[PDB]
Amino acid sequence: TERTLVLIKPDGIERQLIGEIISRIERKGLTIAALQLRTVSAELASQHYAEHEGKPFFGSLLEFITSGPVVAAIVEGTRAIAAVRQLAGGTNPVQAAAPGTIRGDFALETQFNLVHGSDSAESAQREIALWFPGA
Template identity: 60%
Template sequence: MERTYVMVKPDGVQRGIIGEVISRIERRGLKVVAMRMNTMSLDSAKKHYAEHAQKPFFNSLISFITSGPSVSMVVEGKNAISVMRAVNGATNPVNAATGSIRGDLALDTGRNIVHASDSPESATREITIHFKESEITGYTRADEACIYEN
C-alpha cells in the first residue's frame, strides 16, 4: 500500500469542514493512518514548501499556512497519491472537477482547502517533516476485502 501526506489547510479548519474532507477520503476507500491538528511552525512550513522558495508567492504562502491550525494526515491505500490528488481536484478550484473537494468547496487557488503530495518522493519528504514513523499506525480496515481485489 502507498502512503501520502494530506493537509486540511487553515482555511478548511476555519470553515469547519475537516470532517467533510476526512469523510471524502474514507468514503473513497483510503484510510487515515496518522493525524494531528496543530499550527505549523515557520521552520516546518519552509521545509514543506521549499520547492516554492524562489516564487513570488512564497512569503504569503508561508504566512497563510502558519496563520492558524491545520490538520496533517498520513493517508494509505492502493495508488494513494494519485487517488488523493483526484479527490482534492485541480489546484485552481475553477478548474477542479465537480465532486472533488476543491471543485465543490473552494473558489480561489490561495484558499483551496487541502494539500496532498504530488509524487512518492514528495510524500516521503512531507510525511517525515510532519510525523515520526512511530506516530503512524498500521492497521487493516474491516472493509478492505470489499475495496481491493486480491
C-alpha cells in the first residue's frame, strides 16, 4: 500500500479532463487520499522541478506550471506509484505512451502531457511533503 503524488497540470484543466483523470484512477482501484485545486508559488515550482533545475529549458517548465492553478492529489493503494505511471503513459504522448493511457488518448506534445505522477518511492515521499506539508 503506497502513496504517490499526482498533478493535473494547467493543460489538463483547460481541456476539461479533471473528472476524466480522477475517474481512471478510481476505477483502477486506487483511492483519492488528498485532493486540492491550488496555485503554485514560484518557489514551490522550483522545488518540484529542482532535479531538472540545471537542465536546458528549465525555465519554461516553471512558466507553464504557474500560468494557472493545478489539481494536486495524494493517490493511495496497492502499487499506487507504478499503477499511476501505468495509467498516465510514457512521457512522449505519441512515440511512447500507448493508447488507453491518459497521455496516449489525449496528448500530442511532451510539454503538454496533462498529468504528473511520482516516479519512485523516494520522489513521492519528497513531492508529497512539498505539496501537502501537513500530511
